[PDB]
Ligand binder design. Structure first.
Ligand SMILES: *[C@@H]1O[C@H](CO)[C@@H](O)[C@H](O)[C@H]1NC(C)=O
Ligand SMILES: *[C@@H]1O[C@H](CO)[C@@H](O)[C@H](O)[C@H]1NC(C)=O
Ligand SMILES: *[C@@H]1O[C@H](CO)[C@@H](O)[C@H](O)[C@H]1NC(C)=O
Ligand SMILES: *[C@@H]1O[C@H](CO)[C@@H](O)[C@H](O)[C@H]1NC(C)=O
Lengths: 224, 49, 49
């Protein structure tokens, strides 16, 4: 693949709690993506794994679903168990049963805690599928947003909010992140979360419109 | 303790609480039927002689 | 029938389970799977009586 770099441009803000707040300015301490961060850009034409640094911000903008099925295994071999979070257009399987995978794992189209299969009905179904993955206290939380764009050059100068989807208990020592390819071209951005303090502005309808990163520059420290 | 009434609070479907500045439950969602209710204590105040 | 772990490389995170058993080394000589000099197996039995 081809590795590039692109500025984040105030992207990747989600809902920190399942509580309706309207016309307030709430300050929260949660694993966020910092403003104007140095995220990477991948042009998949080939493909090793990635280090799962406490959260992955996924910002694929092209169509199709060749990049689906990201697995969250610690070691993708025997002895120590591997976690399988394969996603598809039919079903999602959340399995930890060791298995065996290569140094460049992929889905070839042509033990301890098995089954635990979910249906993923909202995922069953300008395609900017902005995704945020998290692992706090063994739980698995998915934040998603489908936001249209005018031009597909770079990330736009706007704002978006991300809503939580699921909650799956795993509780293992996840250290590295890996996407899977259903081999029988792809442009996607990867961002890494960080413990940061945000000041979230809810409107009168209860949605986040503006935010301020409290540890970016002294002006934002004064604002917070 | 408080009255319950129908509200125009646009709850997103993952939300079921509603909080306050002093952290009191402003709104609640019924656990049986997916409906929104408000929470507001009834009449009170000070008296003078 | 029940066994305990003596020590690890570092401390344990809360709500974490340890499965892998390897021969520990407290020096520079590699044990190579043999519990010889400066090599100790982490699993020791209770011996309840
Ligand atoms: C991101 O980090 C790389 C690491 O060398 C650097 O080359 C690149 O210029 C950075 N991107 C920025 C500052 O936008
Ligand atoms: C568990 O994850 C932590 C991440 O900081 C790592 O340092 C540690 O070595 C891992 N445990 C094992 C047994 O590899
Ligand atoms: C809240 O939603 C209503 C729905 O029609 C909309 O008219 C109004 O502009 C919204 N308020 C905003 C976006 O601040
Ligand atoms: C519980 O109540 C809800 C509300 O009417 C209903 O839809 C649901 O079927 C009930 N569940 C059972 C097991 O009766």
């Amino acid at each position: 693949r081809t590795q590039s770099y692109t500025n984040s441009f105030t992207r990747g803000v989600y809902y920190p709690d399942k509580v309706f707040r309207s016309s307030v300015l709430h300050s929260t301490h949660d694993l966020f993506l910092p403003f104007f961060s140095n995220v990477t850009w991948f042009h998949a034409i080939h493909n090793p794994a990635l280090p799962f640094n406490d959260g992955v911000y996924f910002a694929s903008t092209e169509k199709s679903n060749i990049i689906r099925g990201w697995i969250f295994g610690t070691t993708l071999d025997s002895k120590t168990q591997s976690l399988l979070i394969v996603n598809n257009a039919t079903n999602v399987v959340i399995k930890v049963c060791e298995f065996q995978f290569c140094n460049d794992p992929f889905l070839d189209v042509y033990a301890n805690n098995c089954t635990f299969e979910y249906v993923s009905q909202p995922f069953l179904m300008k395609n900017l599928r902005e995704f945020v993955f998290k692992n706090i206290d063994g739980y698995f939380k998915i934040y998603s947003k489908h936001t249209p764009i005018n031009l597909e050059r770079d990330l736009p100068q706007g704002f978006s909010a991300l809503e939580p989807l699921v909650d799956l208990p795993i509780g293992i020592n996840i250290t590295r992140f890996q996407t899977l390819l259903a081999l029988h071209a792809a442009a996607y951005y990867v961002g890494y979360l960080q413990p940061r303090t945000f000041l979230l502005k809810y409107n009168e309808n209860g949605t986040i419109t503006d935010a301020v990163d409290c540890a970016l520059d002294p002006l934002s420290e004064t604002k917070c | 303790t408080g009255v319950l009434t129908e509200s125009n609070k646009k709850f997103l479907p993952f939300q079921q609480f509603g909080r306050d500045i002093a952290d009191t439950t402003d709104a609640v969602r019924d656990p049986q039927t997916l409906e929104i209710l408000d929470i507001t204590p009834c009449s009170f105040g000070g008296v003078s002689v | 029938n029940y066994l305990y772990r003596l020590l690890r490389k570092s401390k344990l995170k809360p709500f974490e389970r340890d499965i892998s058993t390897e021969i520990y080394q407290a020096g520079n000589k590699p044990c190579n799977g043999v519990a010889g000099p400066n090599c100790y197996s982490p699993l020791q039995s209770y011996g309840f009586r």
